[PDB]
Each structure stands twice: as C-alpha cells, then as structure tokens.
C-alpha cells in the first residue's frame, strides 16, 4: 500500500504584534513526527515521536537552519502579497505553504505537492503533472507567470521526485 | 530533508 509525507509551513502576522509567527509541522502517513515553532524560547526543529530521535545532531542542525531561512521567505512574501492585493500594513494576515509526496507500494513517487494559501484562500498550486500551475485569482496569476518563466515547476519537481521520496523511506524504516 | 527555499511570489 501507499504512504505519504507532508509538511505545513504557516506564517501569521498580527496587528502591530511585531514580526509574524512561523510554524512548520511534518507528517509521515498521518502522524506528526517533526515540528518547529518561532514562538519557542529556542526556535528549533524537534522530534515529535521517539523514532525520530535516532537522527544525528547534524540533521536537526540544517533542518533548523532551513526553517530560519523559511521564516524570512514568509516575512518577505507576506509583504509582496500585501501589495498584490493592495491591503494595509498594520493588518493581520496569513500565508502558508504545503508540500509533500505520496509513494506507491513500489516506494516510487505517486504524487508531488507544492502549494500556497493566503489568508485562508487558495493562491497557487503545482498540478499533478509537476509541470503546470493553478492560479486561484488574478494576483496569483502574476506569480504563475514568473514561475512559468523561471521554470519553478522543474525546481520543485526535482525535490518531490527524489529527495523527498528517499527521506519518506528513511523515516518509514525508522519505525 | 525539506523542500528547497521557494521562489519569490
């Protein structure tokens, strides 16, 4: 039978409440196994189940470093989206990303994921072909355009097809 | 490993 891995990064900025809050949670099949919270005293990616404790310190290090970078990405794109939709500045908004991969019984990719939602509504998502994009409204139309131009689809596909699938396996053997 | 840093919106 098929298995899956899924990550959910969500950034939420609040009315004059400083920089947005960033969180990232990962799921293998349908169990949370890793998590990161910027609201933490010591922002770090940490194991949510015991079998993940069998990963080296180097693992948790770069995973955490990626998260810190991601925090900035959201911080910036939350702003570019304010523009796109012509909204205020002190306003309260949310921007989230969801990516992942399902694998078939043969352990090879079954479906790739990469998509974004702003303020609760769909924004843009990589289609099942990992080649084309679906753009919710007109603002998203702008992103789609540059992403089609820059070949974003191939960029994400690269990961979805191999790196992801490979790790989903690392984890599936771990427990 | 996570998905790489994403492109600009």
């Amino acid at each position, epitope marked *: 039978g098929p298995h899956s891995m899924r990550y959910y990064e969500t950034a939420t900025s609040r009315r004059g409440l400083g920089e947005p809050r960033y969180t990232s949670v990962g799921y293998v099949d349908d169990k949370e196994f890793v998590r990161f919270d910027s609201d933490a005293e010591n922002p770090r990616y940490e194991p949510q189940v015991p079998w993940m404790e069998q990963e080296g310190p180097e693992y948790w290090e770069r995973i955490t470093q990626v998260a810190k970078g991601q925090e900035q990405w959201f911080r910036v794109n939350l*702003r570019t989206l304010l523009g796109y939709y012509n909204q205020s500045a002190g306003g309260t908004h949310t921007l989230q990303r969801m990516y992942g991969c399902d694998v078939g019984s043969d352990g090879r990719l079954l479906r790739g994921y990469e998509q974004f939602a702003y303020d609760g509504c769909d924004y843009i998502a990589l289609n099942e072909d990992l080649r084309t994009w679906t753009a919710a409204d007109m603002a998203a139309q702008i992103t789609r355009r540059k992403w089609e131009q820059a070949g974003a689809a191939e960029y994400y596909r690269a990961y979805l097809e191999g790196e992801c699938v490979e790790w989903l396996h690392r984890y599936l053997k771990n427990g | 490993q996570l998905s790489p*840093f994403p492109f600009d919106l």
Partner: T-cell receptor
Amino acid sequence: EAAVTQSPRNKVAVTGEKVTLSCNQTNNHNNMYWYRQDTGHELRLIYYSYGAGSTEKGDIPDGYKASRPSQENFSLTLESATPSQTSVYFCASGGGGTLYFGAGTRLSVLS
Amino acid sequence: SVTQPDARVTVSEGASLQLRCKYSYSATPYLFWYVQYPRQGPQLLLKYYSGDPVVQGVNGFEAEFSKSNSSFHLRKASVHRSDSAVYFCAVSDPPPLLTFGSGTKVIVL
C-alpha cells in the same frame, strides 16, 4: 542582467577608509548577494539578503557590514579598509533559482 | 561543493570543447554553468533542475547531468575565438545560496 548595476566600477581606498559599495536591481527580486573574486577564480559570498530588512552573513563576513534598506538596494560596507579586502566585488539578485550578476567593482586598498 | 578538475584548457578554434564538473552534494542538486568574459560579471549559460538530463544553453552550449557519475560536464561542438573566457560550474548549495567552482580558463587558438 542589465538590471543589476554596481557603483562604482573602480575604487581606490586608503587603509582605514569606510567604503560602501552600492548595488541596484530593477529585477524585482527579493534575494540579493555580494560576492568577491580575487584571482579570477572562485567567487565567495560575503553577505546576502532575503529581501528588504534582511542581512545575512556569508562565508567571509568579517570586516564587512551590509544593508538592505529597500527592495532594489543592497549595499556592502567595509567599515575600515584593509588590504586583505582589495578584490573585485560582485553583486547579484535572484528570485529563486538563477542568480544575475552586476558588472563588478574593482576595489584596491593602498596602504 | 562542486569541482572543476582542470584549471586551464586549450582548444583549436573550430574543435569541440568539454569542461568537466563533479559535484558532491547530498541534497537535491541544482546545477548551473556560468561564463565570465574579461572585466565582466558571470553570465548564465545553462542550468539543470529535473527532467531531460541534457540541458541546452545559449551560444551552442549544452551540459549533461549524471546522478550516477555525479557530474554535470559542459560541451560545445565547435568553439570560436569568442568563447575564450573563464567557465564556472556551480551548485545551489543550500538554496537560495550559490556555490561556485574554482573555474576553468578556456583558450582558443
């Protein structure tokens, strides 16, 4: 990219001088970088930025300070020029994936 | 980390050119090739993300990605004087950061 313009192209500084290299990009890119190449060889990252307000140290940030006041402006500052900093500085912008470089800024430090 | 084994390479105008590039990088490899003409910044030649392992670039340049051989060698079937320059192989180390190779100087006769 003709969108990335550095200033100046040639600069000579005296030891101790506070030097500020300026970069401008009309690519509407969030990421901007400052590399240095000094043997026609490998370019090495000094500082980069995820977007306005972001300032991240590279592999050799010592003696350098950076500033991302806005979207299209990223400036590298040598607080106190030292001959170890004479090199060719390149600025780049990118919206994920491909990086686009400026013409370069040749900076020499006379003692 | 990316490695360009040859510091200098010389070819007879009209001949084929091949610049080797090996990469050691655990994560998803995002490889590129930049050319740097005298007194100028690096310019993108070609890049490889996924799909066709053989990518095409500007100026009759192409490269082939080989997960097995861990290479991303560059090639041009017929070089001209114009191609004399320094060629860089680069891998997106942690994206969005880019790590350059030591470069290779190409001299055409």
